[PDB]
Write a protein that binds this ligand. Structure first.
Ligand code: 428
Lengths: 118, 114, 117
């Protein structure tokens, strides 16, 4: 899985260990091994949410499976919680786009995760 | 709705008011209140379009619905016009990816829109 | 087509000619003329892969068509090879998300690529 956070919060406000915490929490949430979790945080961004430049975040979570109605609600509570606690961003100023990726559409290690057919 | 612009145009060339203009014009075009609109502009990027480093932009617009043939052509006219006028980027050096998001696949305020 | 690379490798480590090599090799790989190809490289990123901050890359390739099982495996070999050779990133610390875009969902030059209806 891949989690990306873009925010206008300053770099200095991103706590040390934040990427590690995201990695561990996402492994737990998705049930995927931590070795396959990638995290990316992009601070100091020029953005607005509802016309306002108060702290906000635009995020995406890509996963092969483990994406869906109830699961995404669970992910949203988890991730908004982390953004609010760690970056002090209000949950109502966060968007998270979820993407259920097909294995054949994810490249890794010179190939893709579609190793079964030709 | 959510609009992202990545461009190699320098930050100093982004005019005061640009995010607000994007917010207001996208609210108008999508039929959604300005409260719903998020915008994100990323200048000074290392990019090329057609192998050239002249001004260009790679963009995305995500919306729950309001995405389709005629609507997307209308968004493109609107957004290319703004990029050309405000950032001096030629329309034929802009790509915009449109995404029609399922409400269940958009998180906000501790839940999703489903 | 549009190819984006986000990486924690520093800007200074991106070699002269990298954007042009990506442009040309992607034109070759997808069978599309180079005029169509857009590339975007974002260094110095705060990212981790598998809980490690060793060099890694998160990438996307968007194309109208030319996306599929065997083709994507070919793109991955090409692109991981370039990231390994040029940026010294291990292929097993690279993810590439592939997107088969509908012509109606790609804007360009004041319109889209859906010009038929
Ligand atoms: C931010 C919040 C008021 C909000 C944003 N959106 N976007 C939609 O597309 C639909 C409902 C909605 N509520």
């Amino acid at each position: 899985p891949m989690f990306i956070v873009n925010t206008n919060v300053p770099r200095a406000s991103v706590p040390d260990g934040f990427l590690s915490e995201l990695t561990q929490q996402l492994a737990q949430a998705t049930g995927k091994p931590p070795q396959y979790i990638a995290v990316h945080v992009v601070p100091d961004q020029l953005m607005a949410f509802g016309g306002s430049s108060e702290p906000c975040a635009l995020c995406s979570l890509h996963s092969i499976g483990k994406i869906g109605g109830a699961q995404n609600r669970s992910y949203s509570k988890l991730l908004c919680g982390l953004l609010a606690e760690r970056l002090r961003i209000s949950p109502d100023r966060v968007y998270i786009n979820y993407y259920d990726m097909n294995a054949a559409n994810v490249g890794w290690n010179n190939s893709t995760f579609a190793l079964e057919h030709h």
